[PDB]
Ligand binder design. Structure first.
Ligand SMILES: Cn1ncc(Cl)c1C(=O)N1CCCCC1
Ligand SMILES: [Zn+2]
Ligand SMILES: [Zn+2]
Ligand SMILES: [Zn+2]
Ligand SMILES: [Zn+2]
Lengths: 69, 70
């Protein structure tokens, strides 16, 4: 039905929100500290000296173990 | 259709996985450091001395801003 198409789009968008905002290919699993923005995979997070959301300096990257992983 | 029911179930399960493992009511937005388990809301994370998943000592809690926050 048309509702099947609507639900497929909602699921696709929720899954895309869990993917790295830089490479778009790997799951988010890293937090920039101290700002807390959690928007990258470990490979993209390792290559950024400043947060891509707020431009704060990255003091270090904390790996996150999420239940959605 | 039955396909619509299957997709509704998938969506519901993904949304439930984003909720705090202790209160089951608020979104996860806190990480236990240094272990990295990110399974609680701020209130529930605040008084735990050890991680509820791996038992490691909680040195501090890091707030996390996730793109899925609704
Ligand atoms: C230009 N740049 N500087 C740091 C990072 Cl990260 C990037 C970046 O956009 N990419 C593309 C996707 C894969 C990782 C590298
Ligand atoms: Zn990436
Ligand atoms: Zn930031
Ligand atoms: Zn809670
Ligand atoms: Zn832990």
């Amino acid at each position: 039905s048309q509702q099947t198409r609507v639900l497929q789009e909602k699921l696709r968008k929720l899954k895309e929100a869990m993917l790295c905002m830089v490479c778009c290919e790997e799951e988010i699993n890293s937090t920039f500290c101290p700002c807390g923005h959690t928007v990258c995979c470990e490979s993209c997070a390792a290559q950024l000296q400043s947060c891509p959301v707020c431009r704060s300096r990255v003091e270090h990257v904390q790996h996150v173990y999420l239940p959605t992983h």
